[PDB]
Amino acid sequence: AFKEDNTVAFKHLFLKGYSGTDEDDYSCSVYTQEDAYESIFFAINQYHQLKDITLGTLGYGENEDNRIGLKVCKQHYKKGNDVELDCVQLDLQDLSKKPPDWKNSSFFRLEFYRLLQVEISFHLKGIDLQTPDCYVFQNTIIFDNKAHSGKIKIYFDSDAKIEECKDLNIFGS
Amino acid sequence: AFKEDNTVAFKHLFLKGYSGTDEDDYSCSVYTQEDAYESIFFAINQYHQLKDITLGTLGYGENEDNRIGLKVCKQHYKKGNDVELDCVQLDLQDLSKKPPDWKNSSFFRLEFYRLLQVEISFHLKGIDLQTPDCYVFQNTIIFDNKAHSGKIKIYFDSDAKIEECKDLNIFGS
Amino acid sequence: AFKEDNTVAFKHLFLKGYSGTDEDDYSCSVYTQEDAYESIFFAINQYHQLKDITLGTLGYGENEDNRIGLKVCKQHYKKGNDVELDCVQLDLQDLSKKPPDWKNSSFFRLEFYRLLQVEISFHLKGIDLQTPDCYVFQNTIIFDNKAHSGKIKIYFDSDAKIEECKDLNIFGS
Amino acid sequence: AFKEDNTVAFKHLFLKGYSGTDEDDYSCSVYTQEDAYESIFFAINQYHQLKDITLGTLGYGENEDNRIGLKVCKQHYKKGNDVELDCVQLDLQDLSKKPPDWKNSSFFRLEFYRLLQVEISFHLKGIDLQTPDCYVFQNTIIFDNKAHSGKIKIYFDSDAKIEECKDLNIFGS
Ligand SMILES: [Cl-]
Ligand SMILES: [Cl-]
Ligand SMILES: [Cl-]
Ligand SMILES: [Cl-]
Ligand SMILES: [Cl-]
Ligand SMILES: [Cl-]
Ligand SMILES: [Cl-]
Ligand SMILES: [Cl-]
Ligand SMILES: [K+]
Ligand SMILES: [K+]
Ligand SMILES: [K+]
Ligand SMILES: [K+]
C-alpha cells in the first residue's frame, strides 16, 4: 500500500485540478493552450514548493543521470515526419531564482500544432514509517499530444523501488 | 479516431461550461436568458480567438456558400404559427472590430417566448499528422428552444469529410 | 412533456444551487441557517425577476384565493407540542419596493430550533406553443424541517392543469 | 432516524468541503499541509459558531471528564518508534478570545512527516421534538495520517445515547 498510496497523493499534488479519479488510461486532460501551460507550470511549481505541501515522509532524490531537480523534455516535428527531442534540466536553484528565468526560455514557447509531447521526470525518496523501508519514486508526468485531436492527455507514472536508507533530508524535519 | 476525437475537443472549446459528458441527446442546457446569451456569445468568442485556444492542427475553412466566418441563424414565430428565419454572417473582420458592432445588432435582441432556435454554423479544416489526411469539419451549434419548456437544449453537430490538402493556414504555424 | 418539462426548468429557476438531479424524494437540502435563508430569499427573488430569467412562454397567475404574488407560510411550535401557522402575502409591488421592507418583517426572523416548515406557493400560467393549450401551474416550494435533524429538505411541487386561454401577459411580449 | 440523521448534518457542519458522500471508510481527505490546517481549523471554528449555524435542536454538552468545549489530541513519533500523545482543551472562552491565542500555541505547529493523527472530540446535546427524547452525541473528528502515504483520511464518528432531559440551553432559544 505505501508505494501505491503515495502515487495517489502525487496525482493530487502535481496534476492541476485532478478530480481524484482517472479519466481513462490517463489521469486528466486539457483542451486549450492556456490550460496546457497552466498544468505544466503547476506541476513544476508544486515540485519547487514540495516541502510546504506534502503530508508524506518524503525528500528530493537524484535522477538516474545524477542531475538534480526536474528533467523537462519535449518532442515536436522538425521545421521541415522527423521528430526532434529537446530537454532542459531545472534544478532547485533554477526554480528558486527571482526572476525565474527558466520560464522565459525558448524551450517553454510551445508550438502546439507540431508538439507531440512534453515529459517532466524526477525522483522522490520516501520512508515507510508505519513498518524502516526506504523507497525511491521514479516519477514521470506525460502531456501527450500525439493524437493531435485537440486534447492533451495527462499521465502520471510512478515506479517505486526499495533502496538503502542513505539520503537524510525529509521535508519538515 | 481523428475526426471523432476532434468533435470531443470542439464541445470543450465551444460549449460554455461543458462538463465533458453529454446530458442526453444534447451536450448541455440552459434555463435562463442570461445563460442562453452567455453560451451563444461564448461559442462566437471562442471561434474568434480559436488560434490562441486550440491544441489541434486546425485552421478556419470557407462555408458551403463561400462566405467566411460564422453563419448565425434564428427561427421565431412571426409577430402576427408562421415561422420566420433570419440569418447574419459574422466574418473574421466583423468579430475583430472594436467596438464589436455585431453584438449590438437587432438580430441579437432575442425574444425567448417566441424563439424556436438559434443555429451557429462554420467550417474548420484539420490535418491528421499522426497518419497526411486533411479533413473539413462542418460544425453546427444548435440552441434548441422548440419545446418552449423553459429549457434550451444545446447540440454540437460535426460532419467531417476527407478533402485535398489545399488550405495552408494552420493556427500557430 | 410540456407540463413535466416546465417542472424541471422551475427547479433550476427557483432552487438555489440545484444540481439538476433530485437528492432523494426532495430536490435539495441545506444544513446551515445562512444557507436556509439564502435558499428562501433566492426563490422569492427569482419569482420577483421571472420576466428577465425564464426561457419559457409564461406569465404570473392569480392564486386560488385571488391574492397576487407569493404566499409564504411557516409552521412552528408555539412559545409554551401546539403548532402555529403564520402566513404573509408578497405581491408584485411588495417585491419591487425599495427598500424591500418585506425582508425586515418579523415573519422572516426564523427560529430554526422550533421551525417545522416554510412553504412558498404561487401560480404561473404557460402556453404550449409547440401544439394552443394554456396551463395553470400551482407551484409550492417546501423547506421541510419536521425531522429537526439539522437538515432542511427542499421540495418543489407543481400541479399543472389545462385552462382557458384568458390571461394575456407573457414575459418578453 | 434522529441520531443517524444528525450525524449526516454534523459531517456537513464540521468537515470542510464535505461532498455529501463518504469517500470510502472515511468521509473525506486532504493531500496538502495547507488543506490539513484549513480542515482542522474549520471544524474548530464551526464548533465555536455552532449556535449561528445549526438548523437542529442542539446545545453544547460537557465531556466525559467534565471539561467543556473541545479536546484536541495529537499523536506523533518522539524526537529520538515511540509515540507521544499531547492534548489541549479549548473551552468556549478560549475560542471566543480576541486575539484567539489558542491558534498560536506550539500544539498547532504540526510536523506532518512524524504526525500520526489529530483527534477533535466534543459532546453535543439534542432533543428529538418530532417524538421528548434527549440525546447526548459523543463526536470525534479523526485526521488520520498513520499510513504516512501523503493522504490524511478524515473520519467523523458520533455515538449517540438517550439521556435525561436536564441541560436547558438549545441554540436560538
Ligand atoms: Cl495561451
Ligand atoms: Cl514545441
Ligand atoms: Cl438577460
Ligand atoms: Cl428572436
Ligand atoms: Cl444566519
Ligand atoms: Cl419561525
Ligand atoms: Cl502550510
Ligand atoms: Cl505534530
Ligand atoms: K508503475
Ligand atoms: K456526425
Ligand atoms: K404533481
Ligand atoms: K457510531
Curated annotation (Swiss-Prot), chains A, B, C, D:
Forms homooligomeric complexes; probably tetrameric. Can heterooligomerize with MCOLN1; heteromeric assemblies have different channel properties as compared to the respective homooligomers and may be tissue-specific. Interacts with TMEM176A. It is found in: Cell membrane; Late endosome membrane; Lysosome membrane; Recycling endosome membrane. Residues 16-32 are annotated as: Extracellular/lumenal pore loop. This is Mucolipin-2. Belongs to the transient receptor (TC 1.A.4) family. Polycystin subfamily. MCOLN2 sub-subfamily. Residues 1-173 are extracellular. Disulfide bonds join C73-C87, C134-C165. The gene is MCOLN2. Nonselective cation channel probably playing a role in the regulation of membrane trafficking events. Acts as a Ca(2+)-permeable cation channel with inwardly rectifying activity. May activate ARF6 and be involved in the trafficking of GPI-anchored cargo proteins to the cell surface via the ARF6-regulated recycling pathway. May play a role in immune processes. In adaptive immunity, TRPML2 and TRPML1 may play redundant roles in the function of the specialized lysosomes of B cells. In the innate immune response, may play a role in the regulation of chemokine secretion and macrophage migration. It comes from the Eukaryota. The most N-terminal extracellular/lumenal domain (referred to as I-II linker or polycystin-mucolipin domain) contributes to a structure with a four-fold rotational symmetry in a tetrameric assembly; the structure contains a central highly electronegative pore with a 14 A diameter. The pore is critical for Ca(2+) and pH regulation. The protruding structure formed by the I-II linkers may contain all the interaction sites with lipids and proteins in the endolysosomal lumen.
